[PDB]
Amino acid sequence: MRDYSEIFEGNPLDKWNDIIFHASKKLSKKELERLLELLALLETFIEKEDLEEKFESFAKALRIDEELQQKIESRKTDIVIQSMANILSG
Amino acid sequence: MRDYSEIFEGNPLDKWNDIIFHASKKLSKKELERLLELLALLETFIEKEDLEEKFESFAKALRIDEELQQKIESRKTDIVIQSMANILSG
């Protein structure tokens, strides 16, 4: 046994933050650079594809959409899980 | 005056890391969540636009391209600057 005094009321992003700030500074740095480079890649791709306006619309078609908000919310979770798996990996 | 004993040989990403890990944990957390949500947005957009293959090609057309590598490298710098400006802002 053990003393049960947090399954209910959980926040995925807060754990991602704890893990990023408590893991080896070498690993958290590498993971953060990975995410930064991916972002730069995605941004640059949208531009070369000249979908910049397309994306601004899409990003602006989110406030009113619903299945899409829930969607990027699930994507954030996947990213956090990949993040944590990489830090665990290395 | 002052003692001059780092203009030459500088690394943009190392400063971004110092700033992320030395700033208020409240501000670095907010900035990191911003980047994570943007990434989730960009990923989700590429998918709804069904450009997933298009992006994998593009991301794979980088190893051989050159003006594009230098390009995402400049984009990383812009992102780091925006990052630092937000932490300074709030």
PDB file of C-alpha atoms in Angstrom:
ATOM      1  CA  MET A   1       0.000   0.000   0.000  1.00  0.00           C
ATOM      2  CA  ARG A   2       0.793   3.721   0.175  1.00  0.00           C
ATOM      3  CA  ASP A   3      -0.844   7.012   1.232  1.00  0.00           C
ATOM      4  CA  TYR A   4      -3.250   8.411  -1.327  1.00  0.00           C
ATOM      5  CA  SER A   5      -3.112  12.172  -0.699  1.00  0.00           C
ATOM      6  CA  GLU A   6      -3.741  13.229  -8.108  1.00  0.00           C
ATOM      7  CA  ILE A   7      -5.386  11.114 -10.836  1.00  0.00           C
ATOM      8  CA  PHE A   8      -8.352  13.465 -11.117  1.00  0.00           C
ATOM      9  CA  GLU A   9      -7.732  17.010 -12.293  1.00  0.00           C
ATOM     10  CA  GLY A  10      -4.527  16.595 -14.303  1.00  0.00           C
ATOM     11  CA  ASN A  11      -2.716  18.999 -16.629  1.00  0.00           C
ATOM     12  CA  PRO A  12      -0.509  17.591 -19.469  1.00  0.00           C
ATOM     13  CA  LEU A  13       1.339  20.847 -20.051  1.00  0.00           C
ATOM     14  CA  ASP A  14       2.332  21.285 -16.428  1.00  0.00           C
ATOM     15  CA  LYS A  15       4.025  17.870 -16.507  1.00  0.00           C
ATOM     16  CA  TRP A  16       5.752  18.712 -19.740  1.00  0.00           C
ATOM     17  CA  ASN A  17       7.116  21.835 -18.037  1.00  0.00           C
ATOM     18  CA  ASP A  18       8.292  19.919 -14.891  1.00  0.00           C
ATOM     19  CA  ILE A  19      10.034  17.378 -17.086  1.00  0.00           C
ATOM     20  CA  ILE A  20      11.641  20.050 -19.288  1.00  0.00           C
ATOM     21  CA  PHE A  21      12.966  21.969 -16.239  1.00  0.00           C
ATOM     22  CA  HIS A  22      13.966  18.966 -14.089  1.00  0.00           C
ATOM     23  CA  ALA A  23      15.636  16.767 -16.660  1.00  0.00           C
ATOM     24  CA  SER A  24      19.318  16.913 -17.536  1.00  0.00           C
ATOM     25  CA  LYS A  25      20.018  20.420 -18.913  1.00  0.00           C
ATOM     26  CA  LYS A  26      21.755  18.659 -21.792  1.00  0.00           C
ATOM     27  CA  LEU A  27      18.669  16.694 -22.792  1.00  0.00           C
ATOM     28  CA  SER A  28      16.128  19.484 -22.295  1.00  0.00           C
ATOM     29  CA  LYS A  29      18.371  21.767 -24.391  1.00  0.00           C
ATOM     30  CA  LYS A  30      18.598  19.227 -27.232  1.00  0.00           C
ATOM     31  CA  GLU A  31      14.776  18.679 -27.171  1.00  0.00           C
ATOM     32  CA  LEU A  32      14.067  22.386 -27.178  1.00  0.00           C
ATOM     33  CA  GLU A  33      16.397  22.941 -30.149  1.00  0.00           C
ATOM     34  CA  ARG A  34      14.646  20.075 -31.995  1.00  0.00           C
ATOM     35  CA  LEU A  35      11.253  21.786 -31.513  1.00  0.00           C
ATOM     36  CA  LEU A  36      12.671  25.210 -32.525  1.00  0.00           C
ATOM     37  CA  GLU A  37      14.185  23.768 -35.738  1.00  0.00           C
ATOM     38  CA  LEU A  38      10.970  21.935 -36.583  1.00  0.00           C
ATOM     39  CA  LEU A  39       8.993  25.131 -36.092  1.00  0.00           C
ATOM     40  CA  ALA A  40      11.454  27.059 -38.329  1.00  0.00           C
ATOM     41  CA  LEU A  41      11.013  24.241 -40.904  1.00  0.00           C
ATOM     42  CA  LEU A  42       7.221  24.330 -40.822  1.00  0.00           C
ATOM     43  CA  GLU A  43       7.175  28.128 -41.041  1.00  0.00           C
ATOM     44  CA  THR A  44       9.624  28.193 -43.964  1.00  0.00           C
ATOM     45  CA  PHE A  45       7.645  25.435 -45.775  1.00  0.00           C
ATOM     46  CA  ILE A  46       4.381  27.370 -45.471  1.00  0.00           C
ATOM     47  CA  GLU A  47       6.122  30.360 -47.002  1.00  0.00           C
ATOM     48  CA  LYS A  48       7.803  28.594 -49.916  1.00  0.00           C
ATOM     49  CA  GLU A  49       4.424  26.992 -50.592  1.00  0.00           C
ATOM     50  CA  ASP A  50       2.996  30.492 -50.304  1.00  0.00           C
ATOM     51  CA  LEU A  51       0.297  29.243 -47.962  1.00  0.00           C
ATOM     52  CA  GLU A  52       0.974  32.059 -45.508  1.00  0.00           C
ATOM     53  CA  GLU A  53      -2.478  33.601 -46.087  1.00  0.00           C
ATOM     54  CA  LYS A  54      -4.014  30.112 -46.078  1.00  0.00           C
ATOM     55  CA  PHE A  55      -2.476  29.467 -42.612  1.00  0.00           C
ATOM     56  CA  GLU A  56      -3.482  32.849 -41.180  1.00  0.00           C
ATOM     57  CA  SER A  57      -7.082  32.058 -42.261  1.00  0.00           C
ATOM     58  CA  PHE A  58      -6.879  28.536 -40.829  1.00  0.00           C
ATOM     59  CA  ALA A  59      -5.383  29.866 -37.574  1.00  0.00           C
ATOM     60  CA  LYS A  60      -8.190  32.399 -37.623  1.00  0.00           C
ATOM     61  CA  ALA A  61     -10.824  29.762 -38.451  1.00  0.00           C
ATOM     62  CA  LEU A  62     -10.046  28.081 -35.130  1.00  0.00           C
ATOM     63  CA  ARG A  63     -11.752  30.467 -32.720  1.00  0.00           C
ATOM     64  CA  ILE A  64     -15.109  29.436 -34.321  1.00  0.00           C
ATOM     65  CA  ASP A  65     -14.363  25.789 -35.218  1.00  0.00           C
ATOM     66  CA  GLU A  66     -14.612  23.184 -32.421  1.00  0.00           C
ATOM     67  CA  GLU A  67     -13.499  19.788 -33.643  1.00  0.00           C
ATOM     68  CA  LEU A  68     -10.336  21.583 -34.707  1.00  0.00           C
ATOM     69  CA  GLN A  69      -9.638  23.147 -31.307  1.00  0.00           C
ATOM     70  CA  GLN A  70     -10.023  19.746 -29.640  1.00  0.00           C
ATOM     71  CA  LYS A  71      -7.746  18.547 -32.417  1.00  0.00           C
ATOM     72  CA  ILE A  72      -4.756  20.872 -31.893  1.00  0.00           C
ATOM     73  CA  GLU A  73      -5.286  20.158 -28.176  1.00  0.00           C
ATOM     74  CA  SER A  74      -4.706  16.445 -28.886  1.00  0.00           C
ATOM     75  CA  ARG A  75      -1.748  17.352 -31.042  1.00  0.00           C
ATOM     76  CA  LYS A  76      -0.211  19.283 -28.176  1.00  0.00           C
ATOM     77  CA  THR A  77      -0.502  16.136 -26.056  1.00  0.00           C
ATOM     78  CA  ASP A  78       1.159  13.983 -28.741  1.00  0.00           C
ATOM     79  CA  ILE A  79       3.999  16.481 -28.990  1.00  0.00           C
ATOM     80  CA  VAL A  80       4.435  16.534 -25.225  1.00  0.00           C
ATOM     81  CA  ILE A  81       4.536  12.694 -25.200  1.00  0.00           C
ATOM     82  CA  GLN A  82       7.164  12.613 -28.000  1.00  0.00           C
ATOM     83  CA  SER A  83       9.094  15.284 -26.105  1.00  0.00           C
ATOM     84  CA  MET A  84       9.090  13.252 -22.884  1.00  0.00           C
ATOM     85  CA  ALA A  85       9.921  10.054 -24.801  1.00  0.00           C
ATOM     86  CA  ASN A  86      13.008  11.718 -26.375  1.00  0.00           C
ATOM     87  CA  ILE A  87      14.304  12.899 -22.987  1.00  0.00           C
ATOM     88  CA  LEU A  88      13.676   9.400 -21.628  1.00  0.00           C
ATOM     89  CA  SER A  89      15.275   7.948 -24.761  1.00  0.00           C
ATOM     90  CA  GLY A  90      18.562   9.829 -24.702  1.00  0.00           C
TER      91      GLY A  90
ATOM     92  CA  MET B   1      36.309  51.310 -19.210  1.00  0.00           C
ATOM     93  CA  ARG B   2      36.058  47.640 -18.223  1.00  0.00           C
ATOM     94  CA  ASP B   3      38.030  44.381 -18.564  1.00  0.00           C
ATOM     95  CA  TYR B   4      37.664  42.721 -21.942  1.00  0.00           C
ATOM     96  CA  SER B   5      38.181  39.022 -21.164  1.00  0.00           C
ATOM     97  CA  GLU B   6      32.948  37.414 -26.305  1.00  0.00           C
ATOM     98  CA  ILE B   7      31.845  39.271 -29.461  1.00  0.00           C
ATOM     99  CA  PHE B   8      33.614  36.808 -31.743  1.00  0.00           C
ATOM    100  CA  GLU B   9      32.434  33.211 -31.765  1.00  0.00           C
ATOM    101  CA  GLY B  10      28.822  33.588 -30.625  1.00  0.00           C
ATOM    102  CA  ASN B  11      25.960  31.084 -30.553  1.00  0.00           C
ATOM    103  CA  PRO B  12      22.320  32.358 -30.780  1.00  0.00           C
ATOM    104  CA  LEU B  13      20.797  29.133 -29.503  1.00  0.00           C
ATOM    105  CA  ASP B  14      22.948  28.990 -26.395  1.00  0.00           C
ATOM    106  CA  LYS B  15      21.685  32.445 -25.394  1.00  0.00           C
ATOM    107  CA  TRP B  16      18.128  31.431 -26.079  1.00  0.00           C
ATOM    108  CA  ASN B  17      18.660  28.487 -23.721  1.00  0.00           C
ATOM    109  CA  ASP B  18      20.250  30.662 -20.948  1.00  0.00           C
ATOM    110  CA  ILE B  19      17.365  33.096 -21.199  1.00  0.00           C
ATOM    111  CA  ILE B  20      14.736  30.327 -21.185  1.00  0.00           C
ATOM    112  CA  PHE B  21      16.284  28.679 -18.083  1.00  0.00           C
ATOM    113  CA  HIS B  22      17.187  31.860 -16.158  1.00  0.00           C
ATOM    114  CA  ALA B  23      14.071  33.923 -16.682  1.00  0.00           C
ATOM    115  CA  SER B  24      11.041  33.839 -14.413  1.00  0.00           C
ATOM    116  CA  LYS B  25       9.655  30.268 -14.504  1.00  0.00           C
ATOM    117  CA  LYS B  26       6.276  31.874 -15.141  1.00  0.00           C
ATOM    118  CA  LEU B  27       7.426  33.657 -18.284  1.00  0.00           C
ATOM    119  CA  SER B  28       9.533  30.826 -19.711  1.00  0.00           C
ATOM    120  CA  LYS B  29       6.564  28.475 -19.170  1.00  0.00           C
ATOM    121  CA  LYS B  30       4.157  30.811 -20.995  1.00  0.00           C
ATOM    122  CA  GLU B  31       6.641  31.233 -23.922  1.00  0.00           C
ATOM    123  CA  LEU B  32       7.215  27.513 -24.202  1.00  0.00           C
ATOM    124  CA  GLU B  33       3.463  26.825 -24.277  1.00  0.00           C
ATOM    125  CA  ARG B  34       3.078  29.490 -27.004  1.00  0.00           C
ATOM    126  CA  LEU B  35       5.684  27.705 -29.171  1.00  0.00           C
ATOM    127  CA  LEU B  36       4.113  24.267 -28.486  1.00  0.00           C
ATOM    128  CA  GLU B  37       0.632  25.524 -29.484  1.00  0.00           C
ATOM    129  CA  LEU B  38       1.989  27.183 -32.618  1.00  0.00           C
ATOM    130  CA  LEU B  39       3.742  23.966 -33.588  1.00  0.00           C
ATOM    131  CA  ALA B  40       0.513  21.966 -32.995  1.00  0.00           C
ATOM    132  CA  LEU B  41      -1.270  24.575 -35.181  1.00  0.00           C
ATOM    133  CA  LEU B  42       1.231  24.365 -38.026  1.00  0.00           C
ATOM    134  CA  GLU B  43       1.221  20.562 -37.928  1.00  0.00           C
ATOM    135  CA  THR B  44      -2.588  20.369 -37.917  1.00  0.00           C
ATOM    136  CA  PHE B  45      -2.797  22.922 -40.788  1.00  0.00           C
ATOM    137  CA  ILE B  46      -0.402  20.905 -42.954  1.00  0.00           C
ATOM    138  CA  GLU B  47      -2.592  17.873 -42.384  1.00  0.00           C
ATOM    139  CA  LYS B  48      -5.962  19.480 -43.086  1.00  0.00           C
ATOM    140  CA  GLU B  49      -4.364  20.915 -46.221  1.00  0.00           C
ATOM    141  CA  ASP B  50      -3.108  17.398 -46.879  1.00  0.00           C
ATOM    142  CA  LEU B  51       0.377  18.722 -47.538  1.00  0.00           C
ATOM    143  CA  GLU B  52       1.916  16.114 -45.249  1.00  0.00           C
ATOM    144  CA  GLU B  53       3.742  14.419 -48.151  1.00  0.00           C
ATOM    145  CA  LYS B  54       4.619  17.846 -49.572  1.00  0.00           C
ATOM    146  CA  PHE B  55       6.262  18.790 -46.226  1.00  0.00           C
ATOM    147  CA  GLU B  56       8.118  15.487 -45.837  1.00  0.00           C
ATOM    148  CA  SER B  57       9.577  16.078 -49.341  1.00  0.00           C
ATOM    149  CA  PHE B  58      10.425  19.698 -48.524  1.00  0.00           C
ATOM    150  CA  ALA B  59      12.001  18.657 -45.202  1.00  0.00           C
ATOM    151  CA  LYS B  60      13.852  16.034 -47.201  1.00  0.00           C
ATOM    152  CA  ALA B  61      14.821  18.515 -49.936  1.00  0.00           C
ATOM    153  CA  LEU B  62      16.807  20.455 -47.339  1.00  0.00           C
ATOM    154  CA  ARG B  63      19.828  18.193 -46.932  1.00  0.00           C
ATOM    155  CA  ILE B  64      20.725  18.992 -50.601  1.00  0.00           C
ATOM    156  CA  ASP B  65      19.436  22.588 -50.865  1.00  0.00           C
ATOM    157  CA  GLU B  66      21.650  25.378 -49.455  1.00  0.00           C
ATOM    158  CA  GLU B  67      19.886  28.713 -49.628  1.00  0.00           C
ATOM    159  CA  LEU B  68      17.100  26.953 -47.757  1.00  0.00           C
ATOM    160  CA  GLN B  69      19.306  25.662 -44.937  1.00  0.00           C
ATOM    161  CA  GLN B  70      20.716  29.159 -44.411  1.00  0.00           C
ATOM    162  CA  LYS B  71      17.087  30.231 -44.529  1.00  0.00           C
ATOM    163  CA  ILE B  72      15.645  28.052 -41.737  1.00  0.00           C
ATOM    164  CA  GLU B  73      18.808  29.013 -39.818  1.00  0.00           C
ATOM    165  CA  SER B  74      17.767  32.683 -40.095  1.00  0.00           C
ATOM    166  CA  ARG B  75      14.247  31.723 -39.143  1.00  0.00           C
ATOM    167  CA  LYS B  76      15.519  30.056 -35.996  1.00  0.00           C
ATOM    168  CA  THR B  77      17.223  33.336 -35.090  1.00  0.00           C
ATOM    169  CA  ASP B  78      14.028  35.344 -35.688  1.00  0.00           C
ATOM    170  CA  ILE B  79      12.097  32.931 -33.494  1.00  0.00           C
ATOM    171  CA  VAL B  80      14.701  33.164 -30.749  1.00  0.00           C
ATOM    172  CA  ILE B  81      14.526  36.997 -30.932  1.00  0.00           C
ATOM    173  CA  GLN B  82      10.692  36.965 -30.715  1.00  0.00           C
ATOM    174  CA  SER B  83      10.993  34.504 -27.835  1.00  0.00           C
ATOM    175  CA  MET B  84      13.393  36.760 -25.924  1.00  0.00           C
ATOM    176  CA  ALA B  85      11.285  39.838 -26.744  1.00  0.00           C
ATOM    177  CA  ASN B  86       8.152  38.170 -25.266  1.00  0.00           C
ATOM    178  CA  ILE B  87       9.953  37.279 -22.024  1.00  0.00           C
ATOM    179  CA  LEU B  88      11.279  40.844 -21.888  1.00  0.00           C
ATOM    180  CA  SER B  89       7.805  42.121 -22.771  1.00  0.00           C
ATOM    181  CA  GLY B  90       5.802  40.360 -20.081  1.00  0.00           C
TER     182      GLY B  90
END
